[PDB]
Structure formats: C-alpha cells, structure tokens
Amino acid sequence: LFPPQWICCDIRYLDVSILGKFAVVMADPPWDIHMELPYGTLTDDEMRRLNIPVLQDDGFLFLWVTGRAMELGRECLNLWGYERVDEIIWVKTNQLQRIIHWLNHGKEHCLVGVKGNPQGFNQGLDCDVIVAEVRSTSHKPDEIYGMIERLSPGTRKIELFGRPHNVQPNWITLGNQLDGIHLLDPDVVARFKQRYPDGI
C-alpha cells in the first residue's frame, strides 16, 4: 500500500515480526555518544539487542553513525548478520554550496550493509557522496530516499527511529516522536490487530 505509514512506539518493545520483510532497512539511531544529549538515547546493548534480523531476508541496511557509533554501528551491523559493503558520506553545505574533537567535522557517515542474496537492484546508479544543505540539526537529507528508490524501486522499506519529517511513500516509519498509528497495507493491519487487540 504505496503511501506513507507509521507507528509511534518504543522500538525496544515493539514486536517487529508483524511487519513482514523489507528490501531496504534504514535507521538514524539516537546513539549514546555520551555528551549528555538533549534527547533520549538507547544504550549500547539496547541497540545490540534490536530485532533487525527478522526484518529482512535479502536486502540492504542503511545505518547512520558518528563518533564512536562508527565502530559500534559496525558491531551492530555485523551482529545483525550484515556485511558492510559501502559507506555514504554526506557533505554538509549551506545555501551557497560552501562547507559548514581534533578536526572540524564537515560530514556524516552512513554505513551500507547487505544481507543474503539481493536480486533486481540497480546497484551503481548513484555515487557514495551526497551534497545537500543542512536543515535542522539531527536531520538527514531527503536525497537518500531518491538514491534508495532508484536502488530498489517499488519495494517495501522500513525506517527505524524516524521522525515525522521522515515519512515517505513506500515506507513505514517507526519512532517515538510520531503521531500515533497510520497503517494501510491490509496484511500489516491484520497482523497488528492480531498482536495488539487494544493498542499497545
């Protein structure tokens, strides 16, 4: 059911099995990179313990990372059964295309993982560099949904820890800052009532 769907929830406690299988998984997780963050974070084991393996049989994983999440995210990415096969970097600019620890950071990283044998994808249509203007902080550019749609068009995609601006067609956004539940694929609406007769 092509249009946007989403589920406000805690991603730690949500039975993801009801949701089926996806050609692409994307997550921009609120990593505990210390620094007493202004948002709620997941601890390393909570990230480790997420139920990613039940989401895909053959497809790609997209995982934003920063700071120590570069090594951790690689851990989670292998622990979940993926192989890091690419790594996109987003170069942050301003409205006139100039760039915004030890070095000042001009980019943010996004590990690309694969699982199983995926077939039908148009690998190699985009390159691994995104150049886009920073909107709000903590956000991530819209261009990645273009790259992902070209990669695997018309297929089911799931986002984890999505915020409301993340809701896109062909996609299902999960996250704790969303407006309730909005489900249109009947197979999902059925497995959801079966598992959650009275909401969660």
Partner 1 sequence: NDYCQHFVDTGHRPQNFIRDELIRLKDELIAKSNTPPMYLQADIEAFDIRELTPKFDVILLEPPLEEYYREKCWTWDDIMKLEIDEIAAPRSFIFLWCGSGEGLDLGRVCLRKWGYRRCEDICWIKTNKNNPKTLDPKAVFQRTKEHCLMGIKGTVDIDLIITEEPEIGNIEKPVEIFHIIEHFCLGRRRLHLFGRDSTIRPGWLTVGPTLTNSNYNAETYASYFSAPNSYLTGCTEEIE
Ligand X SMILES: Cc1ccc2nc(CNC(=O)c3cc(=O)n4ccccc4n3)cn2c1
| Binding site residues, partner 1, CB under 8 A | 60, 70-71, 74, 83-89, 91, 93, 96-99, 101-107, 109, 112, 114, 121, 123-132, 142-143, 146-147, 150-151
* Least CB distance to partner 1 at residue 37 (A): 20
Residues 110-149 that bind ligand X (CB under 6 A): 138
**From 177, 187, 190, 200, residue interacting with ligand X (rule: CB under 6 A):** 177
Could you give the CA distance from residue 167 to residue 131 in angstroms, rounded to a whole number?
Answer: 21
Name 15's Cβ contacts closer than 8 Å, sequence gap at least 6: 195
* 163 touches, from ligand X, partner 1, none (C-beta below 5 to 8 Å by class): ligand X
The residue with tokens 């949701």 is 19
- 92 known ligand binder: no
Q: According to the annotation, is 11 in a ligand binding site?
A: yes
Asked if residue 10 binds ligand X (CB under 6 A), the reply is yes
Question: Is position 49 an interface residue for ligand X (rule: CB under 6 A)?
Answer: no
Stretch that binds ligand X, among 54-62, 121-129, 146-154, 169-177 (CB under 6 A): 169-177
- Among partner 1, ligand X, none, residue 95 binds (CB under 5-8 Å by kind): none
Task: Please give the Cα distance from 166 to 35 (Å, whole number).
Answer: 25
Query: Could you tell me which residues come within 8 angstroms of residue 74 by beta carbon, excluding any fewer than 6 positions away?
Result: 65, 84, 111
Half-sphere exposure of 155 (CA within 13 A, CB side): 23
What single letter denotes the amino acid at residue 194?
Answer: Q
Question: Of 54, 2, 1, 6, which is closest to residue 163 (Cα–Cα)?
Answer: 6
Question: What single DSSP character describes residue 176?
Answer: T
In the complex, minimum distance from the CB of residue 154 to ligand X, in angstroms, rounded to a whole number? 26
Residue 38 buriedness (CB in 10 A; 0-12 / 13-18 / 19+): exposed
Region from 33-41, 71-79, 120-128, 190-198 binding ligand X, contact rule CB under 6 A: 33-41
Residue 130 labeled ligand binder: no
The footprint of ligand X on this chain (CB under 6 A) covers a number of residues equal to 15
Give the binding site for ligand X (CB under 6 A). Answer: 10-12, 28, 30, 39-42, 138, 161, 163, 175-177
